[PDB]
Amino acid sequence: IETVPVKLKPGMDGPKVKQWPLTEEKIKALVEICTEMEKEGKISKIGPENPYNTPVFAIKKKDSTKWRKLVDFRELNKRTQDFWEVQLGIPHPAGLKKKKSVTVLDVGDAYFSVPLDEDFRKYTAFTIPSINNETPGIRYQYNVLPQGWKGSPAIFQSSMTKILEPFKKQNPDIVIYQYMDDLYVGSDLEIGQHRTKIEELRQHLLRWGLFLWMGYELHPDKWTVQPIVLPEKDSWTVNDIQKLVGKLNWASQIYPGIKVRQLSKLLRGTKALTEVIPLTEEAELELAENREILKEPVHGVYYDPSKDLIAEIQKQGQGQWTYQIYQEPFKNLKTGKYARMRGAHTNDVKQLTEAVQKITTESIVIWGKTPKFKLPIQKETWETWWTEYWQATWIPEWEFVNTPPLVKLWYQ
Amino acid sequence: MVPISPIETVPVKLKPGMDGPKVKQWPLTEEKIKALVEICTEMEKEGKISKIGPENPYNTPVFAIKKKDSTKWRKLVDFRELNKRTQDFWEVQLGIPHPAGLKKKKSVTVLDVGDAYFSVPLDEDFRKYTAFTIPSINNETPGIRYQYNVLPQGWKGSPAIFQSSMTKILEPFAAQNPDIVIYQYMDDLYVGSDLEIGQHRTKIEELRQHLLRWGLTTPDKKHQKEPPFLWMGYELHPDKWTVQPIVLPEKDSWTVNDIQKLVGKLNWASQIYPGIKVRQLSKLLRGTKALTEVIPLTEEAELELAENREILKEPVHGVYYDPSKDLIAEIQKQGQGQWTYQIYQEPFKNLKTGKYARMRGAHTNDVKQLTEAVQKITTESIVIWGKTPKFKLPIQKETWETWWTEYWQATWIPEWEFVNTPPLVKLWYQLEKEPIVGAETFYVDGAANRETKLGKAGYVTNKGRQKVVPLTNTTNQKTELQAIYLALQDSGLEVNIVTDSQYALGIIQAQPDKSESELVNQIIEQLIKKEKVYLAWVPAHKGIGGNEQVDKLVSA
Numbered sequence: 001i002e003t004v005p006v007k008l009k010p011g012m013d014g015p016k017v018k019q020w021p022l023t024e025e026k027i028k029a030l031v032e033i034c035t036e037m038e039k040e041g042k043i044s045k046i047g048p049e050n051p052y053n054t055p056v057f058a059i060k061k062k063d064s065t066k067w068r069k070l071v072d073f074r075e076l077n078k079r080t081q082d083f084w085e086v087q088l089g090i091p092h093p094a095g096l097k098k099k100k101s102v103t104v105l106d107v108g109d110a111y112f113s114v115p116l117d118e119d120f121r122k123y124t125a126f127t128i129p130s131i132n133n134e135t136p137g138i139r140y141q142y143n144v145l146p147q148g149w150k151g152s153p154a155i156f157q158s159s160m161t162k163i164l165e166p167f168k169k170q171n172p173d174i175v176i177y178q179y180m181d182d183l184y185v186g187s188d189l190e191i192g193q194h195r196t197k198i199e200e201l202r203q204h205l206l207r208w209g210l211f212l213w214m215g216y217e218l219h220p221d222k223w224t225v226q227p228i229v230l231p232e233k234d235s236w237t238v239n240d241i242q243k244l245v246g247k248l249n250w251a252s253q254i255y256p257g258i259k260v261r262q263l264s265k266l267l268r269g270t271k272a273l274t275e276v277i278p279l280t281e282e283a284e285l286e287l288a289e290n291r292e293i294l295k296e297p298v299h300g301v302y303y304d305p306s307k308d309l310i311a312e313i314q315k316q317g318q319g320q321w322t323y324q325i326y327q328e329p330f331k332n333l334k335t336g337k338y339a340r341m342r343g344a345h346t347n348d349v350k351q352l353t354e355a356v357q358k359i360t361t362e363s364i365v366i367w368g369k370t371p372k373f374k375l376p377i378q379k380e381t382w383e384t385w386w387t388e389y390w391q392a393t394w395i396p397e398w399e400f401v402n403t404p405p406l407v408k409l410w411y412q
Numbered sequence: 413m414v415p416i417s418p419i420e421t422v423p424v425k426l427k428p429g430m431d432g433p434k435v436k437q438w439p440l441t442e443e444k445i446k447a448l449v450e451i452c453t454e455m456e457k458e459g460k461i462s463k464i465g466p467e468n469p470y471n472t473p474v475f476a477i478k479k480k481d482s483t484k485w486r487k488l489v490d491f492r493e494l495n496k497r498t499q500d501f502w503e504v505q506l507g508i509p510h511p512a513g514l515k516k517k518k519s520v521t522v523l524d525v526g527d528a529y530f531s532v533p534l535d536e537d538f539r540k541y542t543a544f545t546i547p548s549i550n551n552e553t554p555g556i557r558y559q560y561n562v563l564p565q566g567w568k569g570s571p572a573i574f575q576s577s578m579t580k581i582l583e584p585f586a587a588q589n590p591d592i593v594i595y596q597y598m599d600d601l602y603v604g605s606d607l608e609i610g611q612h613r614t615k616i617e618e619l620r621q622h623l624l625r626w627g628l629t630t631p632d633k634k635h636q637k638e639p640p641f642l643w644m645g646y647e648l649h650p651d652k653w654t655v656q657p658i659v660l661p662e663k664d665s666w667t668v669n670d671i672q673k674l675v676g677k678l679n680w681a682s683q684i685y686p687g688i689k690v691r692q693l694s695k696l697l698r699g700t701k702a703l704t705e706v707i708p709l710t711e712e713a714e715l716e717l718a719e720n721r722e723i724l725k726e727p728v729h730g731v732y733y734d735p736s737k738d739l740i741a742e743i744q745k746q747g748q749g750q751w752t753y754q755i756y757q758e759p760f761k762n763l764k765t766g767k768y769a770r771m772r773g774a775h776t777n778d779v780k781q782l783t784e785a786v787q788k789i790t791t792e793s794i795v796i797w798g799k800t801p802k803f804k805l806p807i808q809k810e811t812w813e814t815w816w817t818e819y820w821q822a823t824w825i826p827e828w829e830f831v832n833t834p835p836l837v838k839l840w841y842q843l844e845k846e847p848i849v850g851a852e853t854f855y856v857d858g859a860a861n862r863e864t865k866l867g868k869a870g871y872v873t874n875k876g877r878q879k880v881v882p883l884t885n886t887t888n889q890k891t892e893l894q895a896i897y898l899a900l901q902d903s904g905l906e907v908n909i910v911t912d913s914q915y916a917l918g919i920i921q922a923q924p925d926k927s928e929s930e931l932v933n934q935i936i937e938q939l940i941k942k943e944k945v946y947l948a949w950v951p952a953h954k955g956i957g958g959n960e961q962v963d964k965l966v967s968a
């Protein structure tokens with residue numbers, strides 16, 4: 001009810017980010033949503049003396065039919081002061097990723113109950129564009145904590161912890177973690193028990209209040225990892241052995257003691273690629289020794305919260321995608337694979353967008369932040385389409401990979 | 413007196429840390445001073461400026477300029493320094509409407525709002541920074557000091573604040589009259605509709621009545637401007653649009669500058685004249701920017717210019733947008749990385765046209781370029797019409813399916829259909845997924861000495877076929893490609909090739925059909941001729957037979 005003073009970081013001005021082009025349906029949706037928000041006092045029209053801008057668009061959350069406004073505050077978020085005054089920061093909870101079930105709630109609507117510092121409001125400016133620029137874009141700024149701004153959960157935190165204490169005190173084994181507009185609630189209860197607890201939780205927010213109804217269910221205890229595995233064959237061709245030596249050479253950068261000497265020796269001469277080569281005892285032993293090495297964890301892997309997380313993704317075909325999350329090369333913190341790309345059988349870009357959201361969710365649950373993606377797509381293709389398939393209320397950072405990696409072969 | 417509503421003031425600041433301008437007034441002739449005094453006396457009477465006391469420490473220089481072929485002088489208050497110190501504003505006009513997104517109108521009326529402009533007040537707290545001084549006759553009295561009360565011509569904030577002020581006033585009228593459109597440009601309002609003429613006139617009278625609420629009058633004698641309108645390089649008519657005349661000059665010789673202007677005109681023309689090309693003319697501007705330098709046109713550029721003259725020989729117009737109909741975009745390949753397109757709703761009635769050129773880079777293919785063009789047209793269409801057109805593309809559905817399913821990147825093109833208009837985009841080669849039984853296996857390698865640039869490239873095969881060629885002026889990367897080329901040259905229609913070159917794999921896995929490298933182009937030409945090619949990679953220096961033998965032969 002009293003505002004927290006907020007400032008940008010020293011020697012930085014506000015965001016001045018171009019609004020990207022919007023379809024007619026998204027413009028009409030945003031005009032209707034913002035008319036209501038203005039009436040409720042959440043946003044106000046602004047004049048030309050505010051030169052700032054942040055892009056806005058509209059999405060449909062997963063399994064929903066109502067448009068949701070999504071403001072892309074990535075630039076403002078980078079420019080906004082860090083928040084450690086009251087809390088040093090919320091040590092991320094390591095137990096969340098160990099829960100049998102985690103449900104994600106959209107609690108962003110709670111933030112609109114808290115006013116935003118009057119001197120900071122100008123930096124939240126956004127524009128609803130018109131088709132063909134025929135009419136001046138409709139200009140607004142926020143009067144209340146905005147969804148998607150990193151300052152919102154931070155300022156609202158005292159209110160949330162006070163709203164939640166009785167649920168926590170009554171259920172001490174539930175893990176509850178807030179990230180941006182999301183609330184992550186983990187338990188080891190039978191799902192039925194679990195959903196009732198979730199609905200119990202909704203009621204507290206509802207009671208305090210006077211898209212919240214939705215629930216994204218995850219099961220991180222079943223989440224899958226990808227160790228390095230070598231083929232088991234009875235007949236090896238020259239080509240098979242070449243592929244094996246290739247894969248082992250790559251793996252030797254991750255694992256110290258990998259050897260290819262004896263396997264390489266099998267191919268002495270200049271043989272047809274399809275010729276079958278019997279493994280010698282020396283080669284089988286070396287292979288066996290390599291297999292044993294690959295059953296052990298990679299050495300010297302640790303998470304440093306001061307460093308960015310990086311996520312790489314490979315298209316494997318037939319709807320399959322592999323990914324790795326690391327901070328230092330060859331020191332993977334997590335690897336994985338998807339094939340269950342939903343409602344996207346003839347659309348690569350929709351699949352990739354879904355993969356990016358899934359990986360980001362995993363990252364939030366495990367480390368409490370989003371990774372920087374290296375995306376296997378041309379910039380122009382990604383930027384034209386990703387917004388069509390986006391269902392999350394946060395947005396990670398990304399860069400583009402223009403040269404085909406050879407490593408794709410090694411995660412297949 | 414009929415009360416009028418004030419126009420709300422926009423609060424204005426200088427940039428952080430900056431004070432206002434303190435710039436010396438130049439001396440002026442006695443004649444200029446008398447003229448400026450008269451001009452300023454009238455502006456003062458009209459309320460535009462006010463005399464100020466000696467306390468204000470700010471100043472901006474003023475000049476007098478003679479209105480050509482006239483005995484009347486005009487003032488120029490030079491606000492360049494104040495402009496540097498004034499905050500940035502939101503600028504609404506950055507993106508201009510494209511004519512092809514406009515809707516047909518029966519009537520468009522122009523209303524003059526030049527007088528309304530001076531009912532927009534300048535923020536009281538900022539006025540002091542606009543101070544200026546008319547020097548006195550013979551410098552024998554204090555110069556006359558004034559400041560502005562209104563948006564000064566030439567000040568940074570005037571266009572934005574005028575426009576934003578008019579928009580705010582007009583908003584309720586537009587909202588409650590959805591059967592008209594209103595557009596402001598400079599000192600004019602344009603008001604369009606499809607109403608019968610009496611009703612349209614009624615709406616105009618109602619607009620005039622609305623504006624009087626703020627004491628804003630428009631001229632009774634209606635504007636002289638009527639369709640067609642010359643605007644932003646276009647001609648707008650009630651039911652069609654075009655570009656203003658495109659006139660390509662005749663020349664015996666061309667400079668860099670002439671050619672930049674020629675390409676600029678062709679670029680502007682390409683938004684409604686189908687098939688305009690600028691590649692060969694643009695190739696002439698490569699690397700050099702001495703505007704006076706004379707560049708001989710190549711035969712190819714002369715052909716391009718001739719083809720464009722023929723395209724431009726007579727007028728072409730676009731139609732406006734009917735939201736009730738689908739948009740269709742059709743694309744053709746023109747050659748040399750050039751693509752052209754038309755966007756229409758009814759057959760043979762284009763809304764607009766355009767072109768796309770290949771991006772600069774080492775290697776490319778037609779499918780990638782077609783994709784790029786689709787993404788450009790899509791983004792353009794979202795801006796202009798708010799929706800994606802249905803595409804008609806010169807690529808078979810089967811070709812596209814093969815491409816996207818096998819390509820290492822994610823890729824997508826929106827709803828489209830094949831149109832069988834040559835030249836069709838096709839895949840020129842496709843590498844095997846598995847080694848070929850019965851095909852000879854070529855182990856290739858190359859190396860070069862980094863100092864002498866001497867090198868070797870070659871192969872050994874499972875049949876005992878071998879070749880090593882000595883090369884000059886080469887590099888490790890070139891020799892690795894040379895070796896693959898030799899293997900392709902010397903093999904039958906099906907071939908397995910084993911390389912350790914990450915560089916060569918990286919190129920071939922990008923699936924180019926054309927390259928800036930003559931060698932890569934030769935390799936592509938060979939690949940096109942094969943029935944089956946399997947390309948296998950192995951790591952260098954690991955004892956892998958075949959590879960190890962050839963590596964030894966090429967390293968010396």
Ligand SMILES: Cc1cc(/C=C/C#N)cc(C)c1Nc1ccnc(Nc2ccc(C#N)cc2)n1
Nearest residue numbers: 509514515517595602604639641643648649650
């Ligand atoms: C952008 C624009 C420039 C001018 C004028 C600029 C100038 N000078 C005039 C108007 C009224 C507009 N606004 C819109 C908006 C939607 N459809 C149209 N259609 C439309 C406009 C003019 C003519 C004609 N003749 C026909 C159709 N105009």
Ligand SMILES: CN1CCN(c2ccc(C(=O)O)cc2)CC1
Nearest residue numbers: 525526527529563564565566599
């Ligand atoms: C009637 N007008 C509108 C704006 N124009 C101006 C605005 C300001 C000044 C001035 O500062 O004196 C002159 C013309 C040109 C034509």
Ligand SMILES: [Mg+2]
Nearest residue numbers: 857912952963
């Ligand atoms: Mg070698």
